[PDB]
Design a protein around this ligand. Structure first.
Ligand SMILES: NCc1ccc(C(F)(F)F)cc1
Length: 330
């Protein structure tokens, strides 16, 4: 079997993408953020403290005839930006784009950090990293992808994110009309639980390609592109007036400048990120300083190929027993 669902940016800066997901019987439709950097499926629910809920659609297990409390199980998660949430655990039926998994662990948020409460448009997260990072205790739980793998025509899903436009997550098949040229596959390390791979280098604008190994993770749940300080400095050096701002927390640039493109290497292939994708707009309303989409990973400890990079490509997450990542131009 297969599944296919449209994913939509939540705002005009592509800060995140939401995808409708059906949970329970009869279906309750929630808009979840598909996150290949985590491995929990957690939702706002009828159990979330009412003051921590501001416009989200909530999952109500009591109205689902297929929901079962997973007696004794809890979860607690903390994200790389300081967000967190925790609660108890149900199993229920979960469908994405026609693809149905029964007995999926649905982690019900009792508490959410303030950054989720202020994001009215995101009802929860659907983790698509490897199940070894799932936070359910005492019995670790499998991700939606892991649960669906048996029944999929092919153990893959693909991410086709749009620039200021809707895109597609496909499960179980590769749409050969969604990309141009060939798909270049590259090896994945699963040792930290992430879709971790090694980029073969980079180029700034029309400069020469610098061959150098950049290890990092493919993360649909992260907005920006976080790269080593040396790479990020060489990019922003080509933008007149760009500077790193401690008060803002990263590189900013005069909104009137035109940004060079950024190329990253996949094996021998090259993926070009248009300069327009790197503009994340004024730091505050009316400001003439704009926030850059390429920032340093020095403070994070891992390089992250977030949405800025992934939306320039058609991306194949191959969950074969030896996993790989595929990139194609589109
Ligand atoms: N999108 C999930 C996520 C968030 C943070 C991190 C970090 F910061 F730990 F690398 C990894 C994955």
């Amino acid at each position: 079997s297969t599944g296919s669902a449209t994913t939509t940016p939540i705002d005009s800066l592509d800060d995140a993408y939401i995808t409708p997901v059906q949970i329970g019987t009869p279906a309750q439709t929630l808009n979840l953020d598909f996150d290949t950097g985590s491995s929990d499926l957690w939702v706002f629910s009828s159990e979330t403290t009412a003051s921590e809920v501001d416009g989200q659609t909530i999952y109500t297990p009591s109205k689902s005839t297929t929901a079962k409390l997973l007696s004794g199980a809890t979860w607690s998660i903390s994200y790389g930006d300081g967000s967190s949430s925790s609660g108890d655990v149900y199993t229920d039926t979960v469908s994405v784009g026609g693809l149905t998994v029964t007995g999926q662990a649905v982690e019900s948020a009792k508490k959410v950090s303030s950054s989720f409460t202020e994001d009215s448009t995101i009802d929860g997260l659907l983790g698509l990293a490897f199940s070894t990072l799932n936070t359910v205790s005492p019995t670790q739980q499998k991700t939606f992808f892991d649960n669906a793998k048996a029944s999929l025509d092919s153990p893959v899903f693909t991410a086709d994110l749009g620039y200021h436009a809707p895109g597609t997550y496909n499960f179980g098949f590769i749409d050969t009309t969604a990309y141009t040229g060939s798909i270049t596959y590259t090896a994945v390390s699963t040792k930290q639980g992430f879709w971790e791979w090694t980029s073969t280098g980079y180029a700034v604008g029309s400069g020469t390609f610098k061959s150098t190994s950049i290890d990092g993770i493919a993360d649909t749940g992260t907005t920006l592109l976080y790269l080593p300080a040396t790479v990020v400095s060489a990019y922003w050096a080509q933008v007149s007036g760009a500077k790193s701002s401690s008060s803002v927390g990263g590189y900013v640039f005069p909104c009137s400048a035109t940004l060079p493109s950024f190329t990253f290497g996949v094996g021998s292939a090259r993926i070009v990120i248009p300069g327009d994708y790197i503009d994340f707009g004024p730091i505050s309303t009316g400001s003439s300083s704009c926030f850059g989409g390429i920032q340093s990973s020095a403070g994070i400890g891992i390089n992250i190929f977030g949405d800025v990079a992934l939306k320039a490509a058609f991306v194949v997450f191959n969950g074969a027993t030896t996993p790989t990542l595929g990139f194609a131009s589109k």
